[PDB]
């Protein structure tokens, strides 16, 4: 838990934070206001890929960054 980004709202860090994976499955016109390339907060590389732009990683330099926003 506490990877980097968040599911929909901020502050929290999703319920399942086993592996941090930058999954971007826009599928079709995405859903809500999207996210910062869904940095992660899910399971490990289970197959993913194919269309969905994801970069799975078990932390260790996945989130260590200055900030999310950037005026």
């Amino acid at each position: 838990i506490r990877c980097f980004i968040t599911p929909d709202i901020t502050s929290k860090d999703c319920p399942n934070g086993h592996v941090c994976y930058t999954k971007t499955w826009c599928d079709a016109f995405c859903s809500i206001r999207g996210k910062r390339v869904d940095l992660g907060c899910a399971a490990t590389c289970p197959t993913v890929k194919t269309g969905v732009d994801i970069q799975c990683c078990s932390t260790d330099n996945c989130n260590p960054f200055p900030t999310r926003k950037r005026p």
């Binding site: 929909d8 910062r36 926003k69």
Partner: peptide
């Protein structure tokens, strides 16, 4: 209707909608 509603998301504040 002014500073009542606000869409957070991404990073800044808590719960977005209601």
């Amino acid at each position: 209707y002014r500073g009542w509603k606000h869409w957070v998301y991404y990073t800044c504040c808590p719960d977005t909608p209601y």
